[PDB]
Amino acid sequence: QVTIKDIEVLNCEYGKNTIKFLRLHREGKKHFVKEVEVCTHLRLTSAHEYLDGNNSFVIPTDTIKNIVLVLAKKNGISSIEQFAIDICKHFMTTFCQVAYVKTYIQEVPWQRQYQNGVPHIHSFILVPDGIRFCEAEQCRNGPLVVCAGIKDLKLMKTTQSGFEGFYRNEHTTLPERNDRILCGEFFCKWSYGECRDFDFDCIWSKVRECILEAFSGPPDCGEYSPSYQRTVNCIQMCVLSRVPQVQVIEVILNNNFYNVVDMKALGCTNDKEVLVPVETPYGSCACTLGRKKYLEAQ
Amino acid sequence: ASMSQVTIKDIEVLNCEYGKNTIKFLRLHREGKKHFVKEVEVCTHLRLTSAHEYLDGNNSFVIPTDTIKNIVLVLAKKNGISSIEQFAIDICKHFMTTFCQVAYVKTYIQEVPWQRQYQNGVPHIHSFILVPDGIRFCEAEQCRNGPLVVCAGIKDLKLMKTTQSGFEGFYRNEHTTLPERNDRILCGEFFCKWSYGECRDFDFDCIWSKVRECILEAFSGPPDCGEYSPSYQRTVNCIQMCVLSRVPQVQVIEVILNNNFYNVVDMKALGCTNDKEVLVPVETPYGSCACTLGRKKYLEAQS
Amino acid sequence: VTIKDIEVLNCEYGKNTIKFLRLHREGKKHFVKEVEVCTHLRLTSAHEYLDGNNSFVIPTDTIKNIVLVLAKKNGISSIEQFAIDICKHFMTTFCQVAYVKTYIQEVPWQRQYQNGVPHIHSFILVPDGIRFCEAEQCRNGPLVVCAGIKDLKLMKTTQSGFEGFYRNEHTTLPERNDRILCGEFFCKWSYGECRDFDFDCIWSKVRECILEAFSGPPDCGEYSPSYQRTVNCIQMCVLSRVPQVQVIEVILNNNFYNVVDMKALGCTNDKEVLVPVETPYGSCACTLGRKKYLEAQ
Amino acid sequence: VTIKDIEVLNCEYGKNTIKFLRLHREGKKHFVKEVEVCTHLRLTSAHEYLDGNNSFVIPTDTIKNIVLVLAKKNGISSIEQFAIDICKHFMTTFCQVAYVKTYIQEVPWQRQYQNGVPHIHSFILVPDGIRFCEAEQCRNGPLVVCAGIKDLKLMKTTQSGFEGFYRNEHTTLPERNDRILCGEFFCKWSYGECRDFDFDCIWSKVRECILEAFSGPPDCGEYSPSYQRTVNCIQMCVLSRVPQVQVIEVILNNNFYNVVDMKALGCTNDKEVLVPVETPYGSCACTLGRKKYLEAQ
Numbered sequence A: 001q002v003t004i005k006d007i008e009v010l011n012c013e014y015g016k017n018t019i020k021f022l023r024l025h026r027e028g029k030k031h032f033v034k035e036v037e038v039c040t041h042l043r044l045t046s047a048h049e050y051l052d053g054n055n056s057f058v059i060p061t062d063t064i065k066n067i068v069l070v071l072a073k074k075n076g077i078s079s080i081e082q083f084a085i086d087i088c089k090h091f092m093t094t095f096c097q098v099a100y101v102k103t104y105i106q107e108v109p110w111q112r113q114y115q116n117g118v119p120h121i122h123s124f125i126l127v128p129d130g131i132r133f134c135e136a137e138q139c140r141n142g143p144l145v146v147c148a149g150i151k152d153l154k155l156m157k158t159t160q161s162g163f164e165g166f167y168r169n170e171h172t173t174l175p176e177r178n179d180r181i182l183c184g185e186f187f188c189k190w191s192y193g194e195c196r197d198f199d200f201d202c203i204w205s206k207v208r209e210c211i212l213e214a215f216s217g218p219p220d221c222g223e224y225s226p227s228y229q230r231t232v233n234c235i236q237m238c239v240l241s242r243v244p245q246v247q248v249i250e251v252i253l254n255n256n257f258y259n260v261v262d263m264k265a266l267g268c269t270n271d272k273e274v275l276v277p278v279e280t281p282y283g284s285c286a287c288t289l290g291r292k293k294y295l296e297a298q
Numbered sequence B: 001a002s003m004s005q006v007t008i009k010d011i012e013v014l015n016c017e018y019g020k021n022t023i024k025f026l027r028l029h030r031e032g033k034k035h036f037v038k039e040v041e042v043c044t045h046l047r048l049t050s051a052h053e054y055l056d057g058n059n060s061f062v063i064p065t066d067t068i069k070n071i072v073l074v075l076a077k078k079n080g081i082s083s084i085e086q087f088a089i090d091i092c093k094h095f096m097t098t099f100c101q102v103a104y105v106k107t108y109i110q111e112v113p114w115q116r117q118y119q120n121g122v123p124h125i126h127s128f129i130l131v132p133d134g135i136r137f138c139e140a141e142q143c144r145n146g147p148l149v150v151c152a153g154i155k156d157l158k159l160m161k162t163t164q165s166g167f168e169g170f171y172r173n174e175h176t177t178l179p180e181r182n183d184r185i186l187c188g189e190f191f192c193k194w195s196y197g198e199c200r201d202f203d204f205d206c207i208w209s210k211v212r213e214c215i216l217e218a219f220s221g222p223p224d225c226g227e228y229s230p231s232y233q234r235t236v237n238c239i240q241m242c243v244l245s246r247v248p249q250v251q252v253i254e255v256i257l258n259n260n261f262y263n264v265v266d267m268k269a270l271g272c273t274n275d276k277e278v279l280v281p282v283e284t285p286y287g288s289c290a291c292t293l294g295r296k297k298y299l300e301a302q303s
Numbered sequence C, D: 001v002t003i004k005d006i007e008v009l010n011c012e013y014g015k016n017t018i019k020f021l022r023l024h025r026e027g028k029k030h031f032v033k034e035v036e037v038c039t040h041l042r043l044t045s046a047h048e049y050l051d052g053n054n055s056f057v058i059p060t061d062t063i064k065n066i067v068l069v070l071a072k073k074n075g076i077s078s079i080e081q082f083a084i085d086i087c088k089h090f091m092t093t094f095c096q097v098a099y100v101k102t103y104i105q106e107v108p109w110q111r112q113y114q115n116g117v118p119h120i121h122s123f124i125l126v127p128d129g130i131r132f133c134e135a136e137q138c139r140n141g142p143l144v145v146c147a148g149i150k151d152l153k154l155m156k157t158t159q160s161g162f163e164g165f166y167r168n169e170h171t172t173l174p175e176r177n178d179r180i181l182c183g184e185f186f187c188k189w190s191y192g193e194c195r196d197f198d199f200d201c202i203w204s205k206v207r208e209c210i211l212e213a214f215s216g217p218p219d220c221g222e223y224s225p226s227y228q229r230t231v232n233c234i235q236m237c238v239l240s241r242v243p244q245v246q247v248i249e250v251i252l253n254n255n256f257y258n259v260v261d262m263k264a265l266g267c268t269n270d271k272e273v274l275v276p277v278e279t280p281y282g283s284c285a286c287t288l289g290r291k292k293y294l295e296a297q
């Protein structure tokens, strides 16, 4: 005889997803664009809309959309991180029924066109070299926490990669390799915690450079990777060493193996000339590192 | 910093996880001329008892993701697949009993929805058609020395009712332009996931089917009149309470409803009168709501 | 380089992915037809391209408005009749239209049932092959109607092989008399100008022919010596059983299911565990027409 | 219904999505060309379909093997030359082949740079337009080569309108002399049989013409009176500046950006916040050819 008495609400969450818009800014003839996709989710201090059919405290998801568009118009978007902070602060300062707010934003990667070294006043091209995103979240009476990241970042090096000295058992057929293609799709996300004493765009760029440089090694010789997992650690340690603002960094590496096609039966000798990617199944590894000092201090 | 560099000393590993994703295969079973298929997609992830592969470049304890794939295929061949839940349990148990360096294993499985073809009510011995009316999945996970926990679910389940839906009496402020509505199309894409915890005294396929029926029936109401929904959130609660009322084996149920609004096109400027005849779906932006309900007795009984 | 040096070989424009649901009520009982419509025009002039002169251009926005107005005024008895109505509207209304093509696909909503009782107003999405149609007309030429089914995925676990094929120095494929036959089908058939029949009944009849020819009889099935032969069996079955079909195109995109070699893993895979190859993939395509219909042009 | 009553209008088969990377080393410096290849054949007979006789069928598996062997033996100087090599191989090797078509697209790997210094062996995926080419040949006919760029998304925030279009009772679109012009481009051009040039240099030249004609000069831009006129400006720019292009097809799929009405929200939106409409969407397409090239057939 199952009633509300027997049942606990563990979690209730709602929001508006994929709010797409472009913020246009004009300085005379020169146009500036920031196109974004925004998700904003709320947890309310009550669940009457679920438990009783009573919508009294529910802010319509339509109103969440309107608030995002109004703030874009009124505040502009200097950085997606500042815009995410503004949205979270709006919900927390305005609505007592909001226990928690989270805003996710990703940039549409528009770049200004150039003709013969001259930047175009109002013409752009889509150049996805890794999607910039950020995330702000706040519990009522808790810290406002900001994360930034880069996803759908596909990096490949054609050498200075192996995987040797791994655990062997009766189901292990993988050969030892000291030369292979290292191809990874990266999801990288880092927390600034509460710190905001810096330029969000400059620090995002600095973290991106650390990820590319740690992945590749120096351009004249590169650097040997003994595993996907070690490359993830090199990226994380490089970011933490060079960017003090990063408190916690998560890196997910989804890899594609490139197989040297055996062409003996086709009367041919394939000396790492023709390689076929395996898209599925695929390996993943994931690590989150945090500074001892930041975790201790809570 | 006051250091030119962080070292292992300054850093904590909060999480390390690796695995094999999208292991696709079909398990074929023959009873004379009659063929039976189970095609699945499997993901298996491990956490090891150390992170030396990350911290030191030492792969001694790393089970190749290739070996994870080989083990999944061997177990499919040796054990068969009576249910994806039993197969996920078998995979988790294999990793825990075989590899001392495994601290944690998680197996996710989804079924390719093959249905046997029929001609004039007669089942075909060996011919199938793909019919995605909601993707069946399950998830098993175990910490070393902890419970083996099994969840089942259905995702990409798209349900629509053309009436008996409104949203009224919501909070109003200066940015609220949404009108009150007591008649609209309720169109939802559902993700539903439920925990059996450690309980296994039942047929996984029969109970999965029972939960699916509860979801469709609670969404729709009775076939002769339906049932009024005063919000997406209330419909989620009706689905959850229906499952919890009718299926004692479900301890915890999560439901996510991603909705599409269908707008009655204003056709006045085109010289005609649209009386809820032509409606245009809004795919983005879209609303979502999510609720997880659990039995007090099951949650209490854990620590 | 000027207008003088250049020929316009082709000019075409239109509105894509017009999505809407047409709701019809018979008391408490609701009926839905949700569709995605594309409508394309060729104009008798290209001044909008060649001179920057939009005088004859029907805005793509107007194409959308016309599709929605016709849905409201006429209803949708069948997507084929709706595609005919759209093509006729553009041809009879706009002298600047040289050519119109309307593509329509159905969102595959099915009415929910509880204990064998149909629900008055509740539906579930069941994509077991997308129904579509295409109507096209050149100015004062025939209005031609095609219907079809795409994203139709059929699989049989035996009664399939591929043997006796051409061998050369780059041919490693073994002969096989037992394999899984798994195909994603695109099927499209022309009624030409004929309209003396129920579009929904004939569509259903063609779908049944495709499933039955693919599968063979349910007690024993039927051996397929190639993907290409299975395509021919489907086409000949449709042409035999559905006189209204004049021309039928079938595309079969196949997935090979490989019996995993498990010798190195210390066991024996007797066609028990098979791994699908999604890419690269084989395709074959055939279009058959009735002599009578082709001759009579 | 038998073979007697039916004509085969078309038979075609092939291998789709052959993915591989061709690696080339000059000491420490690595060069990559990763491609996706489709190769389709029409055979001189249809016995595999009509009779269940596979004697002349080249397995699609052999098509894959041939593509990989040619990549290994010849390298890939350009995807156009590789597509030519594949077509020539099938025509010279197999007398049962009536027709061959090879489609190739590049995976857009770019070499990584650190402060202007190229990395010897490290790359990043940067899809700013997918490069493709297509070669086709009928037995005893010319080997024809086309090159192109697709999924090219360009946007300008002004110097775009659409005015003076045809009005009727279903036309609600207002006249506009200022709007965002946002287009996803598919561009494809024919060299015909001509091959007296560097395929990579000419591809780059055509890409620059497309960007420059779309944008106009960087200090003022150039007014577009329609999507259709912008397509014409791109085509005429390519034809003016690249003599090797004989025929050019351009498809523009547009997204309208709507200035959100914010009056009800107590706000004044002066082209500050714009929401893109992804569906439905307008398209226009034009193919232009040189008189000289078309006449000379």
Ligand SMILES: O=c1[nH]c(=O)c2nn[nH]c2[nH]1
Residues within 6 Å of the ligand: A162, A163, A174, A226, A227, A228, A229, A283, B018, B062, B063, B064, B065, B066
């Ligand atoms: O670097 C690697 N890490 C792994 O865990 C793995 N498994 N197979 N190959 C691999 N390579």
Ligand SMILES: O=c1[nH]c(=O)c2nn[nH]c2[nH]1
Residues within 6 Å of the ligand: A014, A058, A059, A060, A061, A062, A063, B166, B167, B178, B230, B231, B232, B233, B287
């Ligand atoms: O049922 C509804 N719940 C919501 O939270 C909501 N927001 N806008 N419309 C809505 N409808």
Ligand SMILES: O=c1[nH]c(=O)c2nn[nH]c2[nH]1
Residues within 6 Å of the ligand: C161, C162, C173, C225, C226, C227, C228, C282, D013, D057, D058, D059, D060, D061
């Ligand atoms: O039935 C088949 N037809 C083909 O053309 C083919 N090519 N490889 N395998 C094949 N199987």
Ligand SMILES: O=c1[nH]c(=O)c2nn[nH]c2[nH]1
Residues within 6 Å of the ligand: C013, C057, C058, C059, C060, C061, D161, D162, D173, D225, D226, D227, D228, D282
């Ligand atoms: O430039 C344009 N061309 C068209 O054909 C059109 N239709 N609506 N808007 C349009 N804009």
Ligand SMILES: [Cl-]
Residues within 6 Å of the ligand: A112, A113, A114, A115, A125, D211
């Ligand atoms: Cl540029």
Ligand SMILES: [Cl-]
Residues within 6 Å of the ligand: A177, A179, A180, A181, A258, A260
């Ligand atoms: Cl290798």
Ligand SMILES: [Cl-]
Residues within 6 Å of the ligand: A291, A292, A293, B006, B010
């Ligand atoms: Cl530190």
Ligand SMILES: [Cl-]
Residues within 6 Å of the ligand: B116, B117, B118, B119, B129, C211
């Ligand atoms: Cl069936």
Ligand SMILES: [Cl-]
Residues within 6 Å of the ligand: B216, C111, C112, C113, C114, C124
């Ligand atoms: Cl049902």
Ligand SMILES: [Cl-]
Residues within 6 Å of the ligand: C157, C158, C178, C271
């Ligand atoms: Cl068998």
Ligand SMILES: [Cl-]
Residues within 6 Å of the ligand: C176, C178, C179, C180, C257, C258, C259
């Ligand atoms: Cl086989």
Ligand SMILES: [Cl-]
Residues within 6 Å of the ligand: C290, C291, C292, D001, D005, D006
């Ligand atoms: Cl006939």
Ligand SMILES: [Cl-]
Residues within 6 Å of the ligand: A212, D111, D112, D113, D114, D124
């Ligand atoms: Cl770079």
Ligand SMILES: [Cl-]
Residues within 6 Å of the ligand: D176, D178, D179, D180, D257, D259
């Ligand atoms: Cl505008």
